[PDB]
């Protein structure tokens, strides 16, 4: 459902 591909990944 969550549509983000990179946004939710923390660097």
């Amino acid at each position: 459902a969550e549509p983000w591909t990179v946004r939710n990944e923390d660097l």
Partner: antibody
Amino acid sequence: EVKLVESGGGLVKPGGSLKLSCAASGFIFSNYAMSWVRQTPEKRLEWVATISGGGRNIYSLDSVKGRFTFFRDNARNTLYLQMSSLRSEDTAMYFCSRENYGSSFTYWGQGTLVTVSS
Amino acid sequence: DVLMTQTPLSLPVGLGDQASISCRSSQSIVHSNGNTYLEWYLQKPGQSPKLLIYKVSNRFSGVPDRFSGSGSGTDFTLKISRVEAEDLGVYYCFQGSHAPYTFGGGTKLEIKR
């Protein structure tokens, strides 16, 4: 560098339809989600929708569900917004925009203008 | 839905001085992953919005450290230092933690002369 170019904006009558496109360049398109954001003539910003890298997972404003549809063609580096049942209030400048690690709206295009009236 | 409110509506400041802008959320904005996706945008006249600040206080590459954001819970603040004329335009806060994602109404920064 990263470039986004919207197109298709124009004059449409209440009730009508209109498809918009956002050509993307300078990055691997399928690797990132994209958003549509619109701005009213009096400058209010409103998120419309976000669609995942491969197109399967979409979110959208409830007031545009069913009338507006969102999809992308990765091999052609192009994102779409198929509009129908347009109303006065849909009138806005329409911007696509790419995600990035930690940021929603990292890169924006120039925008394409949709005017809904008769 | 989350409502995002900004104050003031506009703000004059002189060259060299510091502006300070508030953004308050009608409810908390911690994403299910425990992050807080509060972001700050600048739209200069005649142009598209550009990103300054993400996840409350991270400076996007290219953006000088005259700009920095802060705050928690429901209350955020963006601070511009050593203001130049080129910094004028409307500054927008945005929560991207709970759908539907919402922007504040904008704060116009005016440069005194």
